[PDB]
Structures are given as structure tokens and as C-alpha cells.
Amino acid sequence: QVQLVESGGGLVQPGGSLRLSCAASGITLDYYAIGWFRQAPGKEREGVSRIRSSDGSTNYADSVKGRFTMSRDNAKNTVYLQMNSLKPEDTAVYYCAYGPLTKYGSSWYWPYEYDYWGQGTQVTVSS
């Protein structure tokens, strides 16, 4: 029942900024992760960032730390990825994905695998 839709892709010049949106519908669980991923030309898909619903905790991939920020509008069921200081090598299809957190002992663990994916949005950083 979960569906995710990415939007906001476009063409931007080197050094520019862009904000992506991931709108989710059908989520009923309280404890879940939303991840951003990307696949560049010639490369495998890689993780970009993730956020969890319980407390808003995040993580970012080494290549984007400080330049990209992932955040939420709970009333719109939406997560944003704000990208600043864009580089040519940030060019990719960007995807968002959903996966439940799972509890063991006293802690909720992030998933390795995500269950539902959007169709992606193209981000091109080029002169």
C-alpha cells in the first residue's frame, strides 16, 4: 500500500542548489526509515541519506555530508533533500525508498533493504 513519488529533479549548473521531494502515501507503521539513493551514469545505485520516523535521526553518505540535508514535513507526508554546492558527479537518478525499523532488545534497528521505491527523478549537474 506504500507508494513514494520523487519530484524536483532538473538541470542545474556546477555549484548550484536544488531541492528534491519524496511524497509518501499509505504508510501505517510508526517506526520506519525513508532513504534517498542515487544512480549515476556508469555506476551502481548508492545510498545518499536516511531519516527515521521515530526521532528524526539521520545519516548521510561521506560524499554528501554537509552539502545535502534531509528533512520532513509530517503534515504533507513528505521528506525533502536539499542539495547545495552541487558537483557534476552528483548527476544521477535520485530515488527514495521506505523500509520498516525493527526492534531487538531495547533498540530499533535500521533496515539494510528497503521494501518500496519511487520511480526516481533525474538530477543533472552540468555546464
Author numbering: 1 to 127
From the paper:
Single‐domain VHH antibodies (also called nanobodies) are derived from camelid heavy‐chain‐only antibodies, whose antigen‐binding sites are composed of just one peptide chain (Hamers‐Casterman et al, 1993). Infection is initiated when the Receptor‐Binding Domain (RBD) of the SARS‐CoV‐2 Spike docks to angiotensin‐converting enzyme 2 (ACE2), a plasma membrane protein of the target cell.
The long CDR3 loop greatly contributes to the shape complementarity with the RBD surface. Binding would be entropically disfavored if, in the non‐bound state, this loop was flexible or adopted a different conformation. To address this issue, we also determined the crystal structure of free Re5D06 to 1.25 Å resolution. This suggests a strong stabilization of the loop conformation. Indeed, a closer inspection of the structure revealed such an extensive stabilization by the hydrogen bonds of the β‐hairpin and by other hydrogen bonds and hydrophobic, π‐stacking, and cation‐π contacts.
